Ligand binder design. Structure first.
Ligand SMILES: OC[C@H]1O[C@H](O[C@H]2[C@H](O)[C@@H](O)[C@@H](O)O[C@@H]2CO)[C@H](O)[C@@H](O)[C@@H]1O
Length: 675
């Protein structure tokens, strides 16, 4: 629920949540309000989840870099401190938490990684990364390692990658270009390669995580480690005689860590937005509040000036700020998480050996800039997935058709396991199922296969309820009339047939001069109820529009030099996209019945479909799923397949809400796309 009357706070496990808890107890004393401080695992990922449904904590803590994404998804209440309060914090700390001109959280402290060394094992720490391999050989002889730090999180490896040129998003004229990603340039490659070499020459292991490196350093086994201010406590209790100094340089350049600003945001759904502000502003952001947290685990250089005046006296803090100066404050734009996930994968694969540096970064480069990504994969078909149907009511299930001769009802789980599971496999056709469609109910499926027949399926009971025997050759397409009372099909027998629901052919648009002269590959109903019509693709290179009332030919659309294997109709029934052999997508004006323009794809098109919302046109091509913006006539996405044989999309269909693109491939795998 909401939890009106108390304050649920979330902060990371590596921070002084106990000290904060104290602050919470002090608030409760003066307020009479219970403060609960919890530190869930992966709280940064759960938050956007729970906050979306209206649940979650009242206050969430994390480095600023992740708040832009939360704000964007409306998960954060706008904060508005009095000018008096604002002056208490450094202006630059406020900028860290300012998104689209608004303050979305209270800044707490400036975090920056530093080189932490054991003064007893290494009086003079290396000034450069390059002298570390020799240093490790020297220490290894004495049963000690030179360096150990968390190689699992990109946060720790980024300072070295960025050192000689690597960057996340190009910054220019006071703005970030989210398409200009710098993770695979010469600089980033040089840094990651050096790192990987360290692992190859065994100066550090690819599996070293946070606890391993912290234990090793605190137990005096390794001379140096890399960490933030929050680690100084544990080392204190370990009695190690350490120092905190400038990170080593690489190729003469200083390591450039991404600087985080620990921040506290208030849940958009919280019913204690006021209690939250009173707490953060009058209890936490005070010389007392911070000191209570700082004693638990150091915060770093705090936003609050008054208290920073004391902290800046600590040399470890001065060292923190020197490394901070060599790097830069993290952007808070939504793309940051994509950048982090991208870089994390790259480092791990390059480190594990699964991929080469160039290989790993190249992919990271793509994932960091990627808009539409691979939300998941659904596997069950043992052969090519020929068609995909999505429920009109946007329910949590879809249906697929495959050359394995079956259709599958998928239950969209989304759970870590898979995006969906084969809830029921329906068999019955004696040859490849080429196309499938759902009823308005979303309760029945209508299929067409190369066995020349169509079948109605009762999805719930799992059985075929009707065979449509009429065509004399392979059936290549099927469609349901808007009111689901009429069924249409296309065949290699060059005809288009109309059927009722009882399996009787009510009408046949014969191969006559009016009809097609070759295979009819596709037939679709136009959503327009004013002029009942259907369009048809054909290997006779034409497209035909038909009056559903009298079944009379409206018009023949010529413009293709090869077979047209597919046709899609805009949701409004005004446009119509056609495609096939010649690689060009012709967009027509249904109403008038004339060409509007082309859209080169340079690849054979297999399927088409417009977006439910956006002015988008998607094309299943042998060279990826091309997506143009019907307004700019420009490509906005070109999705290829990466297993890390020629594999290509044969079918695709959007979820009713336009949020997910389902697509079948030749390898029998169904790939889910979306934000
Ligand atoms: O490395 C990916 C990860 O880096 C940062 O998380 C830091 C955090 O800022 C520090 O305060 C401390 O908790 O160490 C974390 C690394 O494990 C980013 O803030 C985070 O968004 C990103 O995923």
């Amino acid at each position: 629920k909401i939890e009106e009357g108390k304050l649920v706070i979330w902060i990371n496990g590596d921070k002084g949540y106990n000290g904060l808890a104290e602050v919470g107890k002090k608030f409760e004393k003066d307020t009479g309000i219970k403060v609960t401080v919890e530190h869930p695992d992966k709280l940064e990922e759960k938050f956007p989840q729970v906050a979306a449904t209206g649940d979650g904590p009242d206050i969430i803590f994390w480095a600023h870099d992740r708040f832009g994404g939360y704000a964007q998804s409306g998960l954060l209440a706008e904060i508005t401190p009095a000018a008096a309060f604002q002056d208490k914090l450094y202006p630059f700390t406020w900028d860290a938490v300012r998104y689209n001109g608004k303050l979305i959280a209270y800044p707490i402290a400036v975090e920056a990684l530093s080189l932490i060394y054991n003064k007893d094992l290494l009086p003079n720490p290396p000034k450069t990364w390059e002298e570390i391999p020799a240093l490790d050989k020297e220490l290894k002889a004495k049963g000690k390692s030179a360096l150990m730090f968390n190689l699992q999180e990109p946060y720790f490896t980024w300072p070295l990658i960025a050192a000689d040129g690597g960057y996340a998003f190009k910054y220019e004229n006071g703005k970030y270009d989210i398409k200009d990603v710098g993770v695979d340039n010469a600089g980033a490659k040089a840094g990651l390669t050096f790192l990987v070499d360290l692992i190859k020459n065994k100066h550090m292991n690819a599996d070293t995580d946070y606890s391993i490196a912290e234990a090793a350093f605190n137990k005096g086994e390794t001379a140096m480690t890399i960490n933030g201010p929050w680690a100084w406590s544990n080392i204190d209790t370990s009695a190690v005689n350490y120092g905190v100094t400038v990170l080593p340089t690489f190729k003469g350049q200083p390591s450039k860590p991404f600087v985080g600003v620990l921040s506290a945001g208030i849940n958009a759904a919280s019913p204690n937005k006021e209690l939250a502000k009173e707490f953060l502003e009058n209890y936490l952001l005070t010389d007392e509040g911070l000191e209570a947290v700082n004693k638990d685990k150091p915060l770093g250089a705090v936003a609050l000036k008054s208290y920073e005046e004391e902290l800046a006296k600590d040399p470890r803090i001065a060292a923190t700020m020197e490394n901070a100066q060599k790097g830069e404050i993290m952007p808070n734009i939504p793309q940051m998480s994509a950048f982090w996930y991208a870089v994390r994968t790259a480092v791990i694969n390059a480190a594990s050996g699964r991929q080469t540096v160039d290989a790993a970064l190249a992919a990271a480069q793509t994932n960091a800039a990627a808009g539409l990504v691979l939300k998941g994969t659904m596997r069950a078909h043992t052969d090519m997935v020929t068609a995909i149907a999505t429920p009109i009511d946007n329910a949590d299930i879809i249906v697929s058709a495959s050359r394995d001769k079956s259709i599958i009802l998928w239950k969209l789980t989304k759970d870590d396991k898979a995006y969906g599971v084969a809830q029921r496999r329906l068999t019955g056709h004696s040859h490849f199922v080429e196309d499938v469609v759902l009823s308005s109910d979303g309760q029945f499926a209508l299929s067409g296969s190369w066995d020349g027949e169509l079948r109605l399926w009762d999805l719930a009971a799992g059985v075929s309820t009707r065979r449509f025997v009429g065509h004399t050759k392979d059936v290549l397409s099927v469609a349901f009339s808007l009111d689901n009372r009429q069924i249409v099909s296309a065949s290699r027998d060059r005809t288009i047939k109309l059927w009722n629901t009882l399996g009787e052919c009510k009408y046949t648009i014969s191969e006559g001069g009016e009809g097609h002269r070759d295979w009819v590959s596709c037939v679709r109903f136009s959503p327009n109820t004013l002029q009942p019509t259907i369009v048809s693709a054909s290997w006779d290179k034409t497209v035909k529009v038909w009056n559903l009332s009298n079944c009379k030919l409206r018009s023949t659309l010529a413009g293709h030099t090869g077979y047209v294997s597919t046709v899609a109709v805009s949701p409004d029934g005004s446009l119509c996209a056609s495609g096939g052999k010649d690689g060009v997508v012709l967009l027509w004006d249904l109403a008038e019945g004339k060409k509007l323009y082309s859209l080169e794809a340079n690849s054979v098109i297999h399927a088409l479909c417009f977006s439910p919302n956006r002015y988008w046109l998607c094309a299943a091509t042998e060279h990826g799923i091309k997506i143009w913006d019907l307004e700019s006539k420009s490509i906005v996405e070109d999705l290829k397949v990466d297993l890390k044989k020629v594999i290509y999309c044969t079918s695709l269909n959007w979820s009713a809400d336009g949020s997910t693109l389902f697509s079948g491939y030749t390898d029998g795998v169904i790939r889910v796309w979306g934000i």
